[PDB]
Write a protein that binds this ligand. Structure first.
Ligand code: FMN
Length: 147
């Protein structure tokens, strides 16, 4: 299968999660294209992919704000070709906050409204992702079994 991973990361935690997920998928034989949201054009972005994984950290002071580089893509998500596309979301946040990983919920809700097929509920990491390696690995295994 061919998967696309697009991540929005300010301090590199969601980028480290995206790289862990990319290796799990490549180790199982998938074809994997991993891109920073900062380098991406929304226009037909998901075209030709069997699975699309979107990663984004949460910002703002209990007023959800998406990671800076991901904003433009979220704004033009209606142009990516998400209708009928198998997708799943992930991101890093702080479980202590009002909207823990609220950017993962917001992205899932728009994808749902755009006709995408959410194959798995979003992976929401608390704290340092390097300490949540087994959950990341376990979530990537489950998405593979869900497509
Ligand atoms: C100023 C500020 C606001 C934040 N807002 C939230 C929030 O509303 N909810 C949440 O779950 N995490 C929030 N975070 C936590 C960050 O999303 C978290 O540190 C995450 O690991 C950052 O990931 P990144 O390095 O991929 O950009 C906030 C952090 C800062 C510094």
């Amino acid at each position: 299968p061919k998967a696309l991973i697009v991540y929005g990361s300010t301090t590199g935690n969601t980028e480290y999660t995206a790289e862990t997920i990319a290796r799990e998928l490549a180790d199982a034989g998938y074809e994997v294209d991993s891109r920073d949201a900062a380098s991406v054009e929304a226009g037909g972005l998901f075209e030709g992919f069997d699975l699309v994984l979107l990663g984004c950290s949460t910002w703002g002071d209990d007023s959800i704000e998406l990671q800076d580089d991901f904003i433009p893509l979220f704004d033009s998500l209606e142009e990516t070709g998400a209708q009928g596309r198998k997708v799943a979301c992930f991101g890093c946040g702080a479980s202590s906050y009002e909207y823990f990983c609220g950017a993962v919920d917001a992205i899932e809700e728009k994808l749902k409204n755009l006709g995408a097929e959410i194959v798995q509920d979003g992976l929401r990491i608390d704290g340092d992702p390097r300490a949540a390696r087994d959950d990341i690995v376990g979530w990537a295994h489950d998405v593979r079994g869900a497509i």
